[model samples]
Target: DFVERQQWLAQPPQKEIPDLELPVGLVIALPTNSENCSTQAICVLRVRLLQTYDIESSQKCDIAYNFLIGGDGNVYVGRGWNKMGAHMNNINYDSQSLSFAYIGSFKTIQPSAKQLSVTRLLLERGVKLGKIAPSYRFTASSKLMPSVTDFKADALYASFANWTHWS
Candidate 1:
């Protein structure tokens, strides 16, 4: 049985971005765009090992990889995660950044070694495509809607792919 992870990390206010979340150990393929378009888009892959929020003891750790969507709208995996948190959303858009200020009894943490290998494969694939970026933002969907009361351990993975023909 093979399950493909697809997590959606969209910018608040307007949830227009598509889905993106790959399994913890799989190489996914990225497509390219056709001519007639002007602008740059990125395909991002992220993982948060630990995210704890406490006024007294606050700790956070995250890692993300960006695949550059070529001018023709194509993407290949790249490297660089040693120094993260360079931009907001993905690695391409940086005008807006995201943060977590909410407090809770027990700090929420999602640490998994499986995800690391999975992301590595993703990056390896990116390398083949020659897609690279500076940094990437990998946050939870809750950040988008902080009003919800009840919560569960239903982590999500997303994969967003599309075709744009500019004129």
Candidate 2:
């Protein structure tokens, strides 16, 4: 019974393509979306831009992230598991982490419960498959904004205040 539920939740139906090599340890969840543009269309277009034209006019490679999760609770494949992500400036850790970006802004629109659950499930599965460290915990970092850091710190403090895992 428990095993069935685990597989169902962790292995929910998803669009599968050719699999990419999995990461060694750690996964970073990033929230992203077009401010005015809603829907997965915007997400697809953005990834296309990343793949085709370097928006900054620099030499470009594949999509920036490994996975993009839509508000509808579906995970879209980007560079996938094996490739190094372009999501972060720090390539050292980025190489070790799977970048999972949310398709929409969480500030205005919170992720659905199922979206959150699936993400957790995906990370759990990653660990089980030996792709992620079993000790992994949710983590966040940013490059451009100090205010974003403040917001995240406060948010984490509030969210984990009553949790046993937070020290």
Report the lDDT tens digits of candidate 1 across residue range 4-113: 11322322211122223222211222111112112222222211111111111222122122332222222222212122221233343321322211111112332133
Residue 93 displacement in candidate 1 (angstroms): 6.6
**How many clashes in each structure?**
24, 0
lDDT of 1 at 73: 29
62 in model 2: Cα distance from truth in Å?
Answer: 1.7
What is the alpha-carbon RMSD of candidate 1 to the true structure?
A: 17.8
Give TM per candidate.
0.23, 0.62
Query: Model 2 — which ten-residue stretch has the worst lDDT?
Result: 1-10
What is the C-alpha RMSD, rounded to one decimal, of candidate 2? 8.4
Q: After superposition, how far is residue 120 of candidate 2 from its true place, in Å?
A: 1.6
**C-alpha RMSD values across all candidates:** 17.8, 8.4
Candidate 2 C-alpha lDDT tens digits along 17-59: 2343454555665665433223455645544544443224433
Give the range of the ten consecutive residues with the poorest summed lDDT in model 1. Answer: 46-55
